[PDB]
Design a binder for these strands. Structure first.
Lengths: 102, 123, 50, 56, 186, 111
RNA sequence: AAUUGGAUUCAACGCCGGGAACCUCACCGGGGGCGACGGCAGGAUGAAGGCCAGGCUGAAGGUCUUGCCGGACGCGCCGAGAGG
């Protein structure tokens, strides 16, 4: 066997949790021992911008959020038990990284 | 080559078209020479089989010596009445007031027929 | 364009080449013979007379 | 006469004149370098399709 | 680079292809682009009121659209798919592009407004607005505001619920800006 | 010390490296890193003037060159932006910029 | 020499400028240079492009004197483009 890390991030809240939940449900029952889906930070990205193209009078200034959230999953299964679980549909728009070590 | 004044033998309107078209396959299968300064070398060494010479070269520098020299090499010459009529014929769609077919390629049944018919009459 | 450029001389049944052939690269490339300084023809190289 | 090519050939190693956008084609006007080189004015028009959120 | 930048790279990728295809596929009747991104061949799903223009006049346009996709991206085998929009009259961006053609054509203002309003209210629009900022064929900067039913509310759960389609309908005397804001039942 | 340096002549024979310990931080840099392909055509026209092939009156847009000991003597034509303003170069000019001596504005009174 | 331009009471003056040493840049001085597509006359009897070397250029065969290659199509205007 081979301890795999699924490191899964997404740009929006609804898309990331459904995959994290589904990954912990399908893997649960087979030849997998699975450590729980741990939430790491939101590296919230602030873009802080000038609205007005005149830059004139008072110019009201847009605050921007890009929030990118990262769930992490350790798993003890084969490379074949890994693809079976990576079958899932996945939101657009959800990055799934795989490191493989023994 | 020639002038618009040199008429030593006849070139029919049926033998000049076949020599506009046996020089066009000559460039797209084998090799062709064109531009008169490179042709004035290919009839003289003995790399040309049949010369074809357009009737508009003047100033004379490559026009006074080549009607009496080409009867001494055992090569026939044939007339096109223009540079734009030998140019389109050369292979390309741009002038060529002289040409030298080095190697017939797929013009070979047509370049042995036109070179004995002009040599029969007068070179 | 620039006419006239008939600089190759004529023998009676042969041709000969007026200009010089390069000694840096092989034959096939003629020299703009200045008398002391040789230009190149294919590309454009500063060559001196050998 | 005759001359060799030109399409500009001077130094532009770095600065603002080095940059151009991928929407309004400018040097001095804004170039947001996060792998989204556009001016500030485009940025505002484009963002709701990007997925940025107005809310503070 | 990292997690953060790549997502933005992707989204920037959406815009460069959605900007060009709108402007071309005004003959078809542009309504969207469902873009499925893979390492095999970028799969773009072009949304049209009508698929018979997008294909082209004999395969030309679908191949043309396959060929400019290779230039922008580094996926050189991008597929083309045409999905219909299921209600183009519920889509505002279709109605904006559709209205723009009609004003390009020269048909009168309130007439060209009435029909439009009437075709989408028949379709199922809780409410609809068309605004037309422009010269209005004189030389004063006045907009004309065609109004029926509910409208966009307050805040932002305003703008998400409604549809909004914008189109510059070109003329040869000036310009006229075509705004069409639809409110679907919800 | 009259004449700047050890003596005008010994700094023509020390050129590369040994001058450096004497010079400012700024003059060192532009010699040591090097100067542009217009600074290479200006080493033919100081050399046509000291000896040999028919000398041109040396003209320059060089305002980033710092004066060396070999170039002392020539009358250098530095384009102010409109026209060429002459400078007879001295040994007291070793260690200053060439764009100092020619103007960057017309010199009048303010008002 | 040019001190690029616009903005002008609130609502022009840390403003367009979320980046002026060249670049930017639109101003000035000087050297050098492309004009589509059609019509018209020209063509390969060799380049429309390149190039030593001086003579000139702040530099660039850029320009002249000067000599020449690789392989083959483009001025001048006239409608009328691209560019600003």
């Amino acid at each position: 066997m081979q301890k795999a890390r699924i490191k899964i991030a997404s740009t929006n809240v609804r898309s990331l949790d459904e995959v994290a939940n589904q990954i912990k449900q399908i893997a649960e029952r087979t030849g997998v021992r699975m450590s729980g889906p741990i939430p790491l930070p939101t590296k919230r990205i602030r873009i802080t911008t000038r609205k007005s193209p005149d830059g004139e009078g008072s110019a009201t200034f847009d605050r921007w959020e890009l929030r990118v959230h990262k769930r992490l999953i350790d798993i003890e299964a084969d490379e074949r038990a890994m693809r079976q679980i990576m079958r899932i549909r996945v939101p657009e728009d959800v990055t799934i990284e795989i490191e493989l070590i023994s | 080559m020639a002038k618009p004044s040199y008429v030593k033998f006849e070139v029919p309107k049926e033998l000049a078209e076949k020599a506009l078209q046996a020089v066009e396959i000559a460039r797209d299968t084998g090799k062709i020479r064109k531009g008169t300064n490179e042709t004035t070398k290919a009839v003289e060494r003995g790399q040309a089989k049949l010369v074809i010479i357009a009737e508009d070269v003047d100033p004379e520098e490559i026009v006074a010596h080549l009607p009496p020299l080409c009867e001494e090499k055992e090569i026939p010459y044939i007339y096109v009445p223009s540079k734009k009529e030998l140019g389109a014929a050369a292979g390309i769609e741009v002038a060529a007031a002289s040409v030298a077919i080095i190697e017939p390629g797929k013009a070979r049944d047509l370049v042995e027929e036109i070179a004995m018919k002009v040599k029969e009459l007068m070179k | 364009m620039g006419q006239k450029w008939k600089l190759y001389e004529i023998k009676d049944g042969k041709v000969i080449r007026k200009n010089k052939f390069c000694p840096r690269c092989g034959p096939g490339v003629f020299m703009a013979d200045h008398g002391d300084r040789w230009a190149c023809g294919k590309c454009g190289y500063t060559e001196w007379k050998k | 006469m005759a001359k060799a090519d030109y399409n500009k050939r001077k130094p532009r190693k770095f600065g603002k004149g080095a940059r151009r956008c991928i929407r309004c084609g400018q040097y001095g006007p804004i170039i947001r370098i996060q792998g989204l080189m556009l001016c500030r004015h485009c940025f505002r028009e484009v963002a709701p399709k990007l997925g940025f959120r107005k809310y503070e | 680079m990292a997690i953060e930048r790549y997502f933005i790279r992707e989204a920037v990728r959406e815009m460069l292809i959605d900007e060009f295809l709108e402007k071309e596929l005004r003959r078809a009747g542009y309504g969207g682009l469902d873009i499925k991104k893979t390492p095999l061949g970028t799969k773009v799903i072009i949304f049209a009121a009508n698929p018979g223009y997008v294909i082209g006049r004999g395969g030309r346009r679908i191949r043309e659209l396959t060929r400019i996709l290779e230039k922008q991206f580094g996926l050189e085998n991008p597929q083309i798919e045409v999905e219909e929009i299921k209600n183009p009259y519920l889509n505002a961006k279709v109605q904006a592009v559709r209205l723009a053609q009609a004003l390009e054509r020269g048909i009168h203002f309130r007439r060209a407004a009435y029909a439009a309003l009437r075709a989408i209210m028949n379709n199922g629009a809780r409410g609809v607005e068309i605004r037309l900022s422009g010269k209005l064929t004189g030389e004063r900067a006045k907009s004309i505001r065609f109004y029926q039913g509910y409208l966009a509310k307050v805040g932002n759960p305003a703008e998400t619920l409604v549809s909004k389609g914008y189109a510059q309908a070109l003329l040869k005397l000036g310009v006229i800006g075509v705004k069409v804001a639809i409110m679907p039942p919800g | 010390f009259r004449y700047r340096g050890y003596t005008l002549e010994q700094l023509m024979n020390m050129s590369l490296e040994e001058l450096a310990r004497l010079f400012p931080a700024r003059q060192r840099r532009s010699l040591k890193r090097g100067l542009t392909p217009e600074q290479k055509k200006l080493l033919r026209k100081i050399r046509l003037a000291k000896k040999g092939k028919y000398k041109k009156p040396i003209r320059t847009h060089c305002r980033d060159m710092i004066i060396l000991p070999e170039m002392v003597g020539l009358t250098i034509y530095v384009h102010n932006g409109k026209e060429f303003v002459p400078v007879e170069i001295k040994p007291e000019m070793i260690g200053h910029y060439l764009g100092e001596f020619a103007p960057t504005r017309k010199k009048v009174e303010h008002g």
